[PDB]
Amino acid sequence: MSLEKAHTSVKKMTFGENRDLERVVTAPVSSGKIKRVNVNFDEEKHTRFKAACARKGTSITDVVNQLVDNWLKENE
Amino acid sequence: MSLEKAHTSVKKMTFGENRDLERVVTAPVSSGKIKRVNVNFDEEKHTRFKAACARKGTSITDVVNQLVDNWLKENE
């Protein structure tokens, strides 16, 4: 113990020297899953969007995701 | 007289008196005719967005305005 016995620092510090790997590689694969696109529509497009939003009962951001869904899976 | 000269703009020098009507009332008109929205597109929706747009020779921004116009004119 004269050697503090803490010299091992918990056996060469088993803290996680193996856990050093910590290859959880969180690498936010979910992050990329979403992108942002700033688009500017016409005044009429906005008014019609509001009516379409209330008619479909959904958010203003969801409706846009819908038109893209009707164009991405159709036009392609 | 010199005094009159002082107020040579007596009548009002028509500085813009007749212009006071301010036809400027003519708001830009184009005012707010363009509204932004900023949407969120899935990784899959974005990957096919650039691919499809590159095929039809359309700007990524114009593509969004296209699907919006379609869904807003087909569903409405």
Side-chain angles (χ1 to χ4, degrees), chain B residues 30-31 33 38 42 54 59:
Chain B
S30 56
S31 30
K33 286 290 184 297
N38 178 273
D42 172 59
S59 338

Short mmCIF file of all heavy atoms in Angstrom, two decimals, chain B residues 30-31 33 38 42 54 59:
data_model
loop_
_atom_site.label_atom_id
_atom_site.label_comp_id
_atom_site.label_asym_id
_atom_site.label_seq_id
_atom_site.Cartn_x
_atom_site.Cartn_y
_atom_site.Cartn_z
N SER B 30 -46.90 44.52 -55.12
CA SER B 30 -46.12 43.31 -55.07
C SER B 30 -45.79 43.04 -53.61
O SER B 30 -45.23 42.00 -53.26
CB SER B 30 -44.83 43.47 -55.87
OG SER B 30 -44.09 44.58 -55.40
N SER B 31 -46.17 44.00 -52.78
CA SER B 31 -45.95 43.93 -51.35
C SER B 31 -46.41 42.60 -50.78
O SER B 31 -47.54 42.17 -51.01
CB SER B 31 -46.73 45.06 -50.68
OG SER B 31 -47.89 45.39 -51.42
N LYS B 33 -46.30 39.92 -51.67
CA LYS B 33 -46.74 38.96 -52.67
C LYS B 33 -45.86 37.72 -52.64
O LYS B 33 -46.18 36.70 -53.24
CB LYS B 33 -46.72 39.58 -54.07
CG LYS B 33 -47.85 40.56 -54.31
CD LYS B 33 -49.19 39.84 -54.39
CE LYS B 33 -50.31 40.81 -54.73
NZ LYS B 33 -50.49 41.83 -53.66
N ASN B 38 -39.96 27.98 -45.24
CA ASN B 38 -38.93 27.11 -44.65
C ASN B 38 -39.54 25.78 -44.21
O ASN B 38 -40.22 25.71 -43.18
CB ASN B 38 -38.27 27.80 -43.46
CG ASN B 38 -37.23 26.93 -42.79
OD1 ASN B 38 -37.54 26.13 -41.91
ND2 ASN B 38 -35.97 27.08 -43.20
N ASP B 42 -37.28 15.05 -45.62
CA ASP B 42 -36.59 13.83 -45.20
C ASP B 42 -35.38 13.57 -46.10
O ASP B 42 -35.34 14.04 -47.24
CB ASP B 42 -37.56 12.64 -45.25
CG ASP B 42 -36.86 11.32 -45.02
OD1 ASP B 42 -36.24 11.15 -43.95
OD2 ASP B 42 -36.95 10.45 -45.91
N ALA B 54 -32.52 17.53 -61.23
CA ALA B 54 -31.40 17.53 -62.16
C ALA B 54 -31.80 16.93 -63.50
O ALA B 54 -31.20 17.22 -64.53
CB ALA B 54 -30.22 16.77 -61.56
N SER B 59 -34.43 24.19 -60.84
CA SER B 59 -33.76 24.58 -59.61
C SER B 59 -34.45 23.96 -58.40
O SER B 59 -35.67 23.83 -58.38
CB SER B 59 -33.74 26.10 -59.47
OG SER B 59 -33.89 26.73 -60.73
#
